[PDB]
Design a binder for this molecule. Structure first.
Ligand SMILES: Nc1ncnc2c1ncn2[C@@H]1O[C@H](COP(=O)(O)OP(=O)(O)OC[C@H]2NC[C@H](O)[C@@H]2O)[C@@H](O)[C@H]1O
Ligand SMILES: NC(=O)c1cccnc1
Ligand SMILES: [Zn+2]
Lengths: 291, 7
């Protein structure tokens, strides 16, 4: 849970600007858009990184390249690599980070409009963020369905297969016989309707607040390299302040910077620490963290 | 909607 700054440079002044904006607009809410960066401190292994036990197990299993684990065609031809990744990444194996708890604090303070996440770890929900405020753009393991006929299956059927040694006899649909898989969006598949639908509604909400207070969209720990999720930032209203907390400037913040863009090069957990400080909520935060 | 998940 302990963090430190990424470099000798201080980001407290930049983080202070954010707290100042929220101070001047006490009845405004914030929309977060997050990626893998906010869960790195949780110890979740990056399947694309050698030196991770997961990477080598997938390589030993003949996975051709990391992302084939999230490819429909590959899964149907050989589901073992995905099952192996699921065993290691299944929700419940990790604990939320300081940044995940920040989302909870904001909710408690009624300043959370929505959190759009590309992650499948569901640590936002595990941390106590309400279902209504979360948009898991790439799905999660909480639901399962047959890839052929769409029949619904309880998530526990899939989960029970992961505890077997070795993992074999994968879940097959008792209607059409095809493989059943967790509701995780694989490369090549459309995201769930709720993604576009909610962004449609939040986009109007954003544009309408510009004319009344002022909202704020904060992008954290994402390389903005996966679409359509990566299109959100450019679609934020020109008149709505965009904030980016990432080790490096990426996506629209790099391709089309905006005068009002606030860029903060900092670890998501350190950022959380500094924001809570500048907001004066250290007391409530500590309570949540110790709860 | 935006299309299918991709790079
Ligand atoms: N602690 C912390 N704080 C802030 N930013 C961080 C941190 N750790 C990593 N990062 C940054 O977060 C970004 C994470 O990028 P990435 O690993 O590509 O994940 P995404 O959220 O964007 O994408 C998911 C990918 N996972 C499966 C699919 O393979 C996708 O390509 C990257 O730009 C990093 O500079
Ligand atoms: N967050 C992830 O685990 C992931 C895996 C593959 C593609 N994109 C994201
Ligand atoms: Zn079926």
């Amino acid at each position: 849970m302990a963090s430190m700054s990424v470099s000798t440079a201080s980001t407290e002044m930049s983080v202070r600007k954010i707290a100042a904006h929220m101070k001047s607009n006490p009845n405004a809410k914030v929309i977060f858009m997050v990626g893998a960066g906010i869960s790195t401190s949780c110890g979740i292994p990056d399947f694309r990184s050698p030196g991770t036990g997961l990477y080598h197990n997938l390589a030993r299993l003949k996975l051709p390249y990391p992302e084939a684990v999230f490819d429909v065609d590959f899964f149907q031809s050989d589901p073992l690599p995905f099952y192996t990744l699921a065993k290691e990444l299944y929700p419940g194996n990790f604990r939320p980070s300081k940044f995940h708890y920040l989302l909870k604090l904001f909710q408690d303070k009624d300043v959370l409009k929505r959190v759009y996440t590309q992650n499948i770890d569901t640590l936002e929900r595990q941390a106590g963020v309400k279902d209504d405020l979360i948009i898991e753009a790439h799905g999660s393991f909480a639901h399962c369905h047959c890839i052929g006929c769409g029949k619904v299956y309880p998530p526990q059927v899939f989960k029970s297969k992961l505890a077997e040694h070795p993992i074999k006899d994968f879940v097959k649909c008792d209607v059409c016989g095809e493989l059943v898989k967790p509701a995780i969006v694989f490369f090549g598949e459309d995201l769930p309707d709720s993604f576009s639908e909610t962004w449609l509604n939040d986009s109007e909400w954003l544009r309408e607040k510009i004319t009344t207070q002022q909202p704020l969209v904060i992008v954290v720990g994402t390389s903005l390299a996966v679409y359509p999720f990566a299109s959100l930032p450019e679609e934020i209203p020109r008149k709505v302040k965009r904030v980016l907390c990432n080790l490096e400037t990426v996506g629209d913040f790099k391709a089309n910077k905006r005068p009002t863009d606030l860029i903060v090069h900092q670890y998501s957990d350190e950022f959380a620490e500094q924001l809570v400080e500048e907001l004066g909520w250290q007391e409530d935060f500590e309570k949540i963290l110790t709860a | 909607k935006g299309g299918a998940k991709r790079h």
